[PDB]
């Protein structure tokens, strides 16, 4: 069965770990420690092909990581996560996309833009602004809620579909 090395990137507190745990464990976490960088795995069925997900949930980017750099060189898809209530996280997408382009040495890498915490009533980051950025990058944009599971499978599924292409 096929293995996909997925990298989850984005600013601290956007809900990367909360997304990873909702996908693999089917449970929401409030409080998950913000510097634990682990790679969780998950067997799924995507479009009739049993396949294995090997997801790195980046944390602690402040400090250096041997295994994080190795995941970045080798990784196959990227989830670029921002929070819909954090304008700084949206701005940081620019730096993450550019960093991926440089480590991978390629204008075209499998990527999905994720606007997390869409379960939330107040929203500082407009749907059009996010859709325009994804449309300028030529990549899908998916709204997600790690709390309600909305769009969570879709985000990880679409990325696997983008690697197949």
């Amino acid at each position: 069965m096929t293995e996909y090395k997925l990298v989850v990137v984005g600013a601290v507190g956007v809900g990367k770990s909360a997304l990873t745990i909702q996908l693999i464990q089917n449970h929401f976490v409030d409080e998950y420690d913000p510097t634990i960088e682990d790679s969780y795995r998950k067997q799924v069925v995507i479009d009739g092909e049993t396949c294995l997900l090997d997801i790195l949930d980046t944390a602690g980017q402040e400090e250096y990581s041997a295994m994080r750099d190795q995941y970045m060189r080798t990784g196959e898809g990227f989830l670029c996560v921002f929070a819909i209530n954090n304008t700084k996280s949206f701005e940081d997408i620019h730096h993450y996309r550019e960093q991926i382009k440089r480590v991978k040495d390629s204008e075209d890498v499998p990527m999905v833009l994720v606007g997390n915490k869409c379960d939330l009533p107040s929203r500082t980051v407009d749907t059009k602004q996010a859709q325009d950025l994804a449309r300028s990058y030529g990549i899908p944009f998916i709204e997600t809620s790690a709390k309600t599971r909305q769009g969570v499978d879709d985000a990880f599924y679409t990325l696997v579909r983008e690697i197949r292409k």
Partner: protein, 156 residues
Amino acid sequence: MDLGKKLLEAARAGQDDEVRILMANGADVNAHDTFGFTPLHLAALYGHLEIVEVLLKNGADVNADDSYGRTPLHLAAMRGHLEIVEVLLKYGADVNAADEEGRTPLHLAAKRGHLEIVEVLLKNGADVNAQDKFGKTAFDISIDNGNEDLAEILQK
């Protein structure tokens, strides 16, 4: 009064004074957040040796595990906190403890490239050949990463 939260925070932040005081007023060394981190997990993860010891000496559970099955030893290995790994063992940490994926501390250290910790775990009776629930072992991880120095340790 919720001194469990006040103790966890203190353990993470490396405030050995606040930890001493908090326990003196009967704060529970096996408090845990909504994902099962004990003060020991946090101290280990964040590299706080004096705090790790004072927690253990005060009866903290060394083989406590979070809701993904990780012991404090797992986390100490994860980060490459060598002197902590040793004292966790000296106080009875299970070397071959397996998280929800079946990974032992050897897998995690091997995977991060923490070779000094791999050497020490093996010396305390780590099982070189244990498979996680997807079949992988330390040696699978060395080949999967092209890590030459690790694959060497795992033979001669």
